[PDB]
Design a protein around this ligand. Sequence first.
Ligand SMILES: Nc1ncnc2c1ncn2[C@@H]1O[C@H](COP(=O)(O)OP(=O)(O)OP(=O)(O)O)[C@@H](O)[C@H]1O
Ligand SMILES: [Mg+2]
Ligand SMILES: [Mg+2]
Ligand SMILES: [Mg+2]
Ligand SMILES: [Zn+2]
Ligand SMILES: [Zn+2]
Lengths: 98, 105, 90, 125, 86, 1396, 85
Amino acid sequence: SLMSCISVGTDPMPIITFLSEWGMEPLEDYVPHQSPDATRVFVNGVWHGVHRNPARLMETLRTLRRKGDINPEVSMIRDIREKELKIFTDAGRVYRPL
Amino acid sequence: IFVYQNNITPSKLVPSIPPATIETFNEAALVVNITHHELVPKHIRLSSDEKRELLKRYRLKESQLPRIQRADPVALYLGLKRGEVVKIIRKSETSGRYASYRICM
Amino acid sequence: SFNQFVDYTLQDIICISFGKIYVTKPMVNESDGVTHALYPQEARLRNLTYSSGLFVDVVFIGRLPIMLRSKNCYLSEATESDLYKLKECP
Amino acid sequence: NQEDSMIMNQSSIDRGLFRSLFFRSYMDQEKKYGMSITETFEKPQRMKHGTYDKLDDDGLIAPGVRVSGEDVIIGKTTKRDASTPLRSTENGIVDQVLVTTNQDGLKFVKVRVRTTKIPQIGDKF
Amino acid sequence: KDQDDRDHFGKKRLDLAGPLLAQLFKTLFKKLTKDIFRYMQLAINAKTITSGLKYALATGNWGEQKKAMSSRAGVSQVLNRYTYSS
Amino acid sequence: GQQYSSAPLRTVKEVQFGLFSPEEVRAISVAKIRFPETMDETQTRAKIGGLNDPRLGSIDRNLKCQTCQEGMNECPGHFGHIDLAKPVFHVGFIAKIKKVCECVCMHCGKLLLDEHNELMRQALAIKDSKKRFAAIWTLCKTKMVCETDVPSRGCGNTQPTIRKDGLKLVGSWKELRVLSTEEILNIFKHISVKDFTSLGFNEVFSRPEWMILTCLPVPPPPVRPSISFQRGEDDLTFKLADILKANISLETLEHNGAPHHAIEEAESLLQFHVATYMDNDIAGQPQALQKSPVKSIRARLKGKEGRRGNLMGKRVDFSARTVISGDPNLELDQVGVPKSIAKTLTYPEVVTPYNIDRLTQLVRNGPNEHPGAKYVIRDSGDRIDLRYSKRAGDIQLQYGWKVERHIMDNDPVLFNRQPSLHKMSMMAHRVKVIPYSTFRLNLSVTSPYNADFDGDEMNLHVPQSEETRAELSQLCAVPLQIVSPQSNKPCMGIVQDTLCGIRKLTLRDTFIELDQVLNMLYWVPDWDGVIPTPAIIKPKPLWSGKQILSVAIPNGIHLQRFDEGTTLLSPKDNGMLIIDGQIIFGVVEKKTVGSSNGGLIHVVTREKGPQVCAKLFGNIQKVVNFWLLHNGFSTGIGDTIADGPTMREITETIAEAKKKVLDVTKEAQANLLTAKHGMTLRESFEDNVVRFLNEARDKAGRLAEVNLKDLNNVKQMVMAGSKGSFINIAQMSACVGQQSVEGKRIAFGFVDRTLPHFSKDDYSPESKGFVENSYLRGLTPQEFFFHAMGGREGLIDTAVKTAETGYIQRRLVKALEDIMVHYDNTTRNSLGNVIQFIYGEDGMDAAHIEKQSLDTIGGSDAAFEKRYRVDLLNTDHTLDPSLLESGSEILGDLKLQVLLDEEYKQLVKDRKFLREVFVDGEANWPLPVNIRRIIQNAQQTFHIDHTKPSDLTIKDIVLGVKDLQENLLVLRGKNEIIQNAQRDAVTLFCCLLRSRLATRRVLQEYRLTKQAFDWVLSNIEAQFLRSVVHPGEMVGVLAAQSIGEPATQMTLNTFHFAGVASKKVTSGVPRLKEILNVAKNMKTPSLTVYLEPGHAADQEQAKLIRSAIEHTTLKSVTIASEIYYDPTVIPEDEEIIQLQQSPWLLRLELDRAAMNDKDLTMGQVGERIKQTFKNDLFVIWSEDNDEKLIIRCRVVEEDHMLKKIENTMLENITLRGVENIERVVMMKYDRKVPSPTGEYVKEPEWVLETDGVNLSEVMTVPGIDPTRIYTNSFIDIMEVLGIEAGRAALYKEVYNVIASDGSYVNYRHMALLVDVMTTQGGLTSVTRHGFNRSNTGALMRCSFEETVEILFEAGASAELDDCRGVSENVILGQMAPIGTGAFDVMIDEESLVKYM
Amino acid sequence: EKAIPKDQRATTPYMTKYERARILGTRALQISMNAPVFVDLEGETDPLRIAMKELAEKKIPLVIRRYLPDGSFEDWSVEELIVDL
DNA sequence: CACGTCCCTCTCGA
RNA sequence: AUCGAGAGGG
Ligand SMILES: Nc1ncnc2c1ncn2[C@@H]1O[C@H](COP(=O)(O)OP(=O)(O)OP(=O)(O)O)[C@@H](O)[C@H]1O
Ligand SMILES: [Mg+2]
Ligand SMILES: [Mg+2]
Ligand SMILES: [Mg+2]
Ligand SMILES: [Zn+2]
Ligand SMILES: [Zn+2]
């Protein structure tokens, strides 16, 4: 398409890092049968966190991008219906502007 | 002819009399006569003097004749044997009646 | 996607092991004359490769084709009257 | 114009409608062979079955020269011929000849031949 | 949950010019440094990156070194220029 | 050139396939291959006496070969050889070698079994060569010992279970032994002279010991060439040096120091080269590569390109191709050839007094002058190029020279589009040299080739001899082909401009004045030059559109058509009636002048001739087009505009449709969806929803058609049939409609939603892909995308799914090649095997066949008497003396009423016979000789007096007919066998004859005189005797195309409607592929089971039948299953229980809705459970009055040993019904049956369809008709009802995918293929194994798949090719016994002097 | 060797379009090779139209040897074969 | 485990 | 030239 553009590849660490700094429980110490209702966090299709108040973070990150402190190309979804949060610095995603 | 109800010992025991054809049919497929069905036409046995006739009148070799399987649900019904021919009268939409012939391979 | 390959992705592949890697704006080394001020139109007519250059501290490596309007390409910065004078099309 | 073909106004074609330019770009070079023996462009003395005469003595045709069939637009020698004849299927007019050298220093040649295509009965639009 | 859609586009990627070069450069640099570890027994080759890179961008087949049998053929094709939009 | 050789000239009639011996290779070898050196004595152009020309072919054009002195063009080549140091398995015979070693004593050399075993003397009886050798190896690999007697014979060594590692064999003893090449060779050589012969081999042509190569044959250069630029040998000349390199290693490695480990390696290496050399696409193996892979000889020959594209198809001289444009001023059978092509295309004319004067002028004109020549070929034969020869002027031609001259006006040429899926796609036209570089063809010959003039390209071929010439003009001429056997109808007709303006012209409002009329009259070249008296005279001499058109229609034509409400005083100029080549009334449209079954074209080509009609084509294209020129016709966006309260009307239709579909949308949103039976709530919903849009969008397309006046242009083109269809008007002006991808609507690519602009889980029609707007209005951002999705699905059909149908045709054409009617009217193949005994079961040609009606069948028993019965003994029912000449003198005559009975008696014997063959009562079928026409063409001919009586006796009528039938010959013969198949072949035609020549009809409604009658009899006799197919006709390669063309061609016009899908790639292309491959894994096995005879219309019998076969299990009704511990513990169970084992409880709850949905209770469910487990389980259950339907079972470790009982009780426990029968739908079909009054009438009756096929069991059910039952699984029907019963099912399952879209192909074609698979014994699939396995000639079957493999087992079984199949002759370069080759031509000295 | 006698014929008595076509062709090829014309060449030049005139007057000295599947045949003389077409 | 419609037109690379 | 790769046309 005309508007269509392609991702390019971001580094995840400064984004993984801002996750722990704002409410990510590392997978090493996860309490399933204790904190079960916990949306899973996915940085580039890898799972190393979960969160208590998801919607508050989808909004926290969503404005980091719209600001710039997070690159505008990295696409982020929250499957509220499935309590999941996938984030992508992926190189090769076809995105349009809206 | 014997009518085995549900099974027969393979105690093989059939082809054993030279001057006798030892035939066997089951009760399950004989419930409804297959030859009554819409698509099954008249199958007629051919005398050894009819076969030897049709083969020379159509100038044929035995191999060249259309073949009917030995175990054909109709070839057994009529108790066909190897070499027997069967004229077949089907109602065609071009001639009304069309004569075909099959040899029992 | 070419630049993000150039401006970074290069030094990444390097990892005797070598240091930061340097790229030269595209030139060609011809039989006598050595350093030729190689441009797109030049190599386009003359049938040469628009090859940049590879150098890293352990020293020469090879030739990287540059895509036009990219990083190490000249036309990236140049202007209309520049290209017109460069036999290239705006 | 039946069956999705069309009728063209010849009056309007004559006035220039849908007149196309066409270009072709034959190429050749002087090949290097080990003991520094190399090819050479030139009118020779084997030869190709076409009209060499339109060549010059540098093995080239100069621009602005009509050419047809299997005419020679490039004479070369490996006597031992490697002349480049025109496309057996085109009838053009030489436009511009280029000569430079390779990244090996080989004498490099590119002939360009020009023709104006004219909307004909059978052309697609 | 439904079965995962095979042709869902948001899950298929588009390897572009850069990463294509990456795939080429790595398999190449990997083999230049293999020749480096042989130089032990600057006199280190340089065409292996020059030609091996020209090789792919020329054929279209994506190098895979040199012996690329049915492996990535048709990635580098000459540009159409019969119209601007073309 | 090729010089003359004394040697006699023959054709090849036998091709003996066998195998070389190592001794015969040494024999023929013109030179031992000693060196691997290319051709380098000193790398000079002189080659090396070691490889390449040590005596074989020549490498240099300027060099004669060292054997046959002819050099280059003439040198066949000469094979060499290289003695192998160690024997080597042949790559192809590798597996066949093993299959033998498994069969023979690897020590004794004798067979592992012999004639003393019952199965070996049985398998040995099979004289089928390859089926015996398979029936031997099957029962030979097992018995692994050299027995010594067992009632002596013969040492005893056990035989090894052999396996293959790849190029080497091994066998286990108890010993890991790698079986040796020579050791196997030594075993094979010792095989009994008669043992290997009975093993599918041959004593002289294919000994087993030759599947092992002791001496390799080297092919000469011409096989593995070498070209210069310096030189470079061929990929196989390399591979040879590779083999020789691998050999010379063994030669010395084994001569001196024998290191065994090295010896056993360079041998395996050599084995490799010899292996890949022949086949390099092996099973395991790396597959060799030389500086790469390498070209295996097997790869040269693999199908498609490689002797299938070197011999089955060639590139050819005397050919051409260019863009094609359409010409309305050309003649049908012509082709405007550009001048330039006619200067490059020649024809070798022979010099003769007839042409010598023309020929020498051309020569002088030369190769530059249009009507010139190129070459002159002398007595001596060397070619004389007229462009460069000095004597190109003072050259004097001799009689008997050949003058390769330019192709001139009116030569015969082969013309063709390229998708040659048609007998018609290659036609012969008259050349007409013209300017500009386009081929020009008459616009009516477009439809045959399916050509339009948009960058379309057509080939042109040109004959070279006067006989291939006549062959084109006497068979493949365009007008000869005007009526196709494909669909027994015209395949050419008026189209585009001419059609659009011919209804515009043929009107009453349409008048032509004088200045315009004389122009029209002149354009008709065959014009009688007489001005037709004007339909209107005096006010202003005017002419009717049709009136002026009629001078082009040839006097002698009578046509009759009635449309909707067409009267004898046509209301809206309805229907059509042409009398004596002038138009009576009615507008001319597609029906009249198209390629209609009984259209004008069809009638003119039959009752007048092929070339007569052709001139008609032009005579109309020259007039109609001329009129349209000066009337003109256009089309704008104005013609796609209704807007005027019809767009106010249509919009309402789409509004309620969004509510009628919203109705069901909310219904099932609250569960209230009365789900249909079989199709789930979702499936059901959509099916009703999907047609609420398609039935509404299709209702705005007729609302569109209504408003649009008769002055609309888009409307006008469709009314004539020019271009356009009902849908088009709808989509453009009214509404586009739902878009269908993969049949179903637009699905949810996103999670449970169709687009990111749409609500999630939105099922509305706007979301699921319904285009509410038209093309005029313009789609929405969404409407467009979906419409873009649907189109692609189409664009995919038209480009990706065409390879399905092009392949099914290849198979069709390949399994039906040799099939042609023979001189006894048999339809046989290349073996003589009889496929049919008369083509199309009536020996008729498909072109002379027309769909006329047999009035003897359908209708009232009352009206039958009225229309046929003649009672001479009667005052009321006798032929009134006004219709006969002797009505009053024959009134009461009784010796004559005996025949009127005989006649009327055979009419009823007729009527009751037809109703046997055509059970549905359909009375319109195709048969030769249009009688509905002939009587008309006789009333106009003798001018019949509707008043004056007839001069015929009852003696005349009934006896003329009786004698006419005896002369309607199909098979001519003498003995009863053939004569009795005469009666048969005709039988049906005669029914129409007696029907239309009824003595009442002849004199009451036909009014025939005597002359008129006898005329009708004699013409009927010939028009029939013409309709007989001709012995030679390639009916098989024709049915193949006739079946394959519409399939390949239907799936090419799928995007003309974009997202429509329909049954294009739904049940057509798919099922047909199934049908041809047969295949048991049918994708939709259905049993359409008819009810019982009596209570067929009352549902309750069908509702009871439904539950008696639906099949049911525990799994069906069960809700949940629970293992319990309880020895009396369950709450809601403790009540039902007051009415050894194990405390382990098995408690399962059932579904109330489910339980009574199959008319079930509990006791039945239980009693079957008890019965499937007997007294080994304890079972109890509740009641239907109970609140919870539960079954409790105790066993009578056992907690996991009970789960077995549950997962066995669930799916393996059988309640009611028959197995496999997964679904059952009850349906009421309207079947036609004869009312007591005799007339056929529509009485419904209930029928059930299934989703499973267990015929053997479902037919034996009480309460149905076991005579009417039907399953689409023709495979199962062949199994149950016999092959002959299956043949009909096969056809019925073939026709059922043809009659959908492109809904007509003629019985014959389908029946031939159908009969093709049938007449073997069972189903013989149209696939590289199904039919290709027959006993056909070797080369034939290799022209279709398994190409090199087939030629292998041919020479290995010492096969012989008959040379009777077309493919054989094609590969051999001989005229094939095909039509023009089915006979031989001779001159008897007698005749030559009878006309001395 | 075997063959059929002309009193035991059984093939269609008319001329097969393939026979007619190969006879008009055969004679044309022969007529164009300067072979004697047995018909009255009435102002004709084309060697096919001569053969068509030769087949219209049935002055063609050719016999069609119609091979039946069994190997045996039965010649028909061009001049005796009816020409319905 | 072998087929995978038909032709036709150009471009380039060992 | 030959093999391979690709883009088009009907
Ligand atoms: N892939 C193909 N394979 C075989 N034959 C094809 C193929 N594509 C097109 N054809 C043939 O060429 C023609 C294709 O139709 P064409 O491209 O001329 O479009 P059209 O029907 O005129 O389209 P439009 O609806 O735009 O007018 C048909 O005659 C078809 O048989
Ligand atoms: Mg077209
Ligand atoms: Mg078109
Ligand atoms: Mg197309
Ligand atoms: Zn020779
Ligand atoms: Zn023994």
